[PDB]
Amino acid sequence: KSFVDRYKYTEKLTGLYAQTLVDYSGVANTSQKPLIVLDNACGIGAVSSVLNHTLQDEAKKTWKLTCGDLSEGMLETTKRRLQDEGWVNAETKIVNALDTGLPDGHYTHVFVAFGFQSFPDANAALKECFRILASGGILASSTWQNFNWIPIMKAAIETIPGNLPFPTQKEFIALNAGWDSESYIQSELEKLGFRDVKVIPVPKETSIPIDEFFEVCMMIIPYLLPKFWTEEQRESHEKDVPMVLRQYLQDTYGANGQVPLEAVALITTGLKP
Ligand SMILES: C[S@@+](CC[C@H](N)C(=O)[O-])C[C@H]1O[C@@H](n2cnc3c(N)ncnc32)[C@H](O)[C@@H]1O
């Protein structure tokens, strides 16, 4: 369980990628046909809010926005936002991304902003996206790749004698093989028939307090070091890693007790032929 697998550190960040996801989808580009859009797992409607502010009035006269989610509590909040912000031709309703009950070939755009990693069956949800998309429809999703926490841990390991092996941020990711992977997403989309698939990484800056950053690292090294250090290296150093890291973190970030850190989301786009 990494930092991006913890709701504590990602809940506050998902809103930062809503505008990004809308821009990459291309939805704001003028098109001939009317827009029929599904904000799948819309939550508090982060994407829907952006859509309504980004789209000009002419495209909104003829479009239909559906905000789907399985939580009534979040739909209650989203319908009040729909009202306050003056969304046009927008609706809220219960929609199971696993089993949407929505028509075949009906939507020009399906948005899934940080949903696939929450679904108990992401493959079922992806096939539903494909089914309900019309010809020429666009699937646009955002998912978590990682926090760039390896270089900080690495800087601490570097201070121990023995020039000890340790993965780069990339190598640790390949230990991990799902929607946090560009190659995996491209393959899963292309299998179902999506074309022109693009998976782009997008970084945003966040920070984690020293105390919590340390605790998470300590939950991970029991798995990570045995894979990279030999028995002899572990016997000499492994027990010292905790105090080394805590010392590094205090020396480096003790002034304000916060670890600056980059969060990377993957923006995915694909076209139903
Ligand atoms: C991390 S939030 C993302 C919310 C919003 N899309 C955003 O950009 O922040 C995940 C959302 O997916 C919803 N969800 C989880 N399982 C679902 C399912 N099977 N069908 C529809 N929504 C689901 C949850 O209710 C939650 O609001």
Ligand code: NA
């Ligand atoms: Na992470």
